[PDB]
Symmetry: C3
Subunit: 299 residues, 3 copies
């Protein structure tokens, strides 16, 4: 069930465009496009994406920024839209469909800090999210987190599921075929990957012995909850949804609803390879294990 | 698998009866009865209910009230019972079966504030809850919530699932056929509906631009968790189980276990239609989307 | 699909060995062994276990203890390992496989209080956990919990699932066949049972009217979350993962991720039998109901 007009389509990834236009105003431009992604070795999914990545590119703004967002729809036949969980907006005015080969621009404020999902909001929403149109926007708190001075390194990890291609019965009633992690870059040099079963096993995240690591995490679903755990450590501090006031300490595992986020911080005390899992182990067996390699130097 | 003695039975809804008999004592009388409910267009489920609604009628009492509860069982063949999560009681003395065409009266205190499930407790409990015998009791806190002065409007929403009719294999091992929201009235004029796939899309909840809305929510299950989210906003304040001490701020999505409740508050800043979902999107696709319509006047 | 070398093997349970060797140092020795357990009446599962129990024996240490742990692998063909969620360790050095008929010793610190899962960490981990190699380690806080002076009795309860025997397709893609509770002894005389559908119904936990009960609970999974609830009461105080700082009050139901723990406290006000459930009622129907019997004397 590949739509006839998508057969043979594979649009190259387009970089996110982003520029600050005032102390509290930021322009962001993203595309909706159809891009082949290898989600498991030998298995291509012709994903519906923002900017040719699934999950989509990371967006980072500051608390109190107003976002002036443009979506250019490169899909030749299906309309697409954008819903940022970070913003206050009218869904029926500001998260509306952009037609094929057209652009739309919408403006809305991000006044809460945290780790928010974004996704396409075109009906049926389950079809658009399951085919790949999901991502994270981080809204950095104006006053930071209480533990910022202790953090040595930070990474972003996103969990998603993949089902049988564009199969609405399976999206509604089936078990996931794969559950996967991806990482998105906060700064130049950091890994930026798609949701697949293998890249973060073959090319682990790096750290050095003794460091306190912060992960910004979100489970975009579409359908499952997550039981997020790093093997070999305990979370020193957890901020639910990345809001600094929702503080928990000393958690072994952090549940996340579908679309839920967190900031989690932990210390790695010995060199070695540390798996990162969802502890719902049927999903870990179906791809959701990433690796952190901790060395004496960090390289 | 409709029990022979229920074929042709459809008992009209009976109003909840409730009266205060002392500063801290309240009488409540409810029925158990068998009532046809249209859960999706064209699809009748011959539900097992309290008072002919599923979920059942809303009960609201004050912290510290003792409830003197009578159940009249109008089912001609199956016994029924009541378990309120709000109360301290002996299950084997106070949540016992009432036989067909009989009444029972039980007395127990509600000393904790919150948003509690109630349900039938007759074995097998899964069969009695899945066939419709669930509901919410709200216990209002003696000293309110810290944010009461900011709240402009409030509604109650309940999430439940429906399965294949009276099919114990499906109740145990199947995926839900429908997942639905209903609303129950806090005051005259407010919507009071059953768990179906369409009423709160066709007849949305109303609000005005700029208002802070409070929802009292509970996921009665029977089997699924919920990832509750309002599109276009972020929750300013969340009180888990409706206890004022379990305060979280700035959540995008609130997980609820089966039977879990919350009070959530959020601001609507622009006119439009705002979907209310569980963000486990397979369940939203199977009915669990309600609408909030925000106008310049509230009408 | 019983491995040829396990046909006919049923190793008798071996007691946990544990001794303190310094103010902050404790030796623990456990076995990995293959033991038949009756998980439902008439149904034997040839479990992969620690010490012949599934879940495994309870381990209790103090915050700040270093554990010097030895695993003796009595399985004649499959390697096994131990991962304690309580500790900081290098997974690729300290949670490594011990071969058949060999021993390994590993040393690591437990510096966080709480109710932690332990399990085998040998690939595929889902197979080793689902076949029975799970358990709990409690790390008692140095300064106790704020509510310790109010607690009259305490018990440990663990929830797990069972699937079709050693069937990796079912472990990954199937619904559980059984979901069960077990209790592990904190002191001599307390019940110590395996995860089965019947023992804690036939031989309930005991308490006396008026007591405040503390349960240390963990949901080891492997795959499901839990909605933990005691019928007839409300939790006065909840400490997520058993860390004293993660305090919630007045909860009807406590969600637990897979591997998540809690300390929950509640008061029983009337004599009777009080069911303990996961409120995801398909799992309660498949075994996950235990009983607490409350008498005027406690006997
Ligand atoms: Cu297509
Ligand atoms: Cu400014
Ligand atoms: Cu693969
Ligand atoms: Cu602009
Ligand atoms: Cu789309
Ligand atoms: Cu959303
Ligand atoms: Cu940073
Ligand atoms: Cu699923
Ligand atoms: Cu699933
Ligand atoms: Cu450091
Ligand atoms: Cu671990
Ligand atoms: Cu949860
Ligand atoms: Cu019937
Ligand atoms: Cu009074
Ligand atoms: Cu319909
Ligand atoms: Cu009375
Ligand atoms: Cu009933
Ligand atoms: Cu209940
Ligand atoms: Cu009110
Ligand atoms: Cu289900
Ligand atoms: Cu389900
Ligand atoms: Cu207002
Ligand atoms: Cu949203
Ligand atoms: Cu075997
Ligand atoms: Cu000392
Ligand atoms: Cu049985
Ligand atoms: Cu030693
Ligand atoms: Cu093992
Ligand atoms: Cu683990
Ligand atoms: Cu104790
Ligand atoms: Cu499952
Ligand atoms: Cu399941
Ligand atoms: Cu006492
Ligand atoms: Cu209850």
């Amino acid at each position: 069930n590949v739509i006839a007009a998508h057969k043979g389509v594979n649009q190259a990834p387009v970089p996110l465009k982003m520029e600050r236009v005032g102390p509290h105003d930021v322009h962001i431009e993203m595309t909706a496009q159809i891009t082949d992604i290898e989600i498991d070795k030998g298995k291509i999914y012709k994903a519906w994406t923002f900017n040719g990545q699934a999950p989509g590119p990371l967006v980072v703004v500051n608390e109190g920024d107003t976002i002036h967002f443009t979506l250019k729809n490169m899909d030749p036949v299906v309309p697409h839209s954008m819903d940022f969980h970070a913003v206050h907006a009218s869904p029926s005015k500001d998260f509306i469909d952009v037609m094929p080969n057209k652009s739309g621009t919408f403006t809305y404020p991000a006044n809460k800090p945290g780790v928010f999902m974004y996704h396409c909001g075109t009906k049926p929403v389950l079809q658009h999210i399951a085919n790949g149109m999901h991502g994270v926007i981080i809204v950095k708190p104006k006053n930071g987190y209480p533990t910022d001075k202790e953090v040595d390194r930070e990474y972003v990890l996103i969990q998603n599921e993949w089902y049988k291609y564009n199969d609405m019965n399976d999206f509604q009633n089936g078990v996931p075929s794969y559950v996967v992690f991806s990482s998105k870059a906060l700064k130049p040099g950091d890994p930026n990957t798609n949701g697949d079963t293998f890249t973060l096993k073959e090319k682990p995240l790096l750290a050095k012995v003794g460091e306190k690591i912060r992960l910004y995490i979100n489970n975009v679903g579409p359908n499952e909850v997550s039981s997020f755990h790093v093997v070999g450590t305990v979370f020193d501090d957890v901020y639910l949804d990345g809001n600094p006031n929702n503080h928990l300490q000393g958690m072994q595992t952090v549940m996340l609803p579908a679309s839920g986020g967190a900031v989690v911080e932990f210390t790695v005390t010995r060199p070695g390879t540390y798996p990162i899992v969802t502890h719902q182990f049927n999903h870990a067996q179906k791809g959701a294990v990433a690796m952190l390699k901790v060395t004496e130097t960090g390289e």
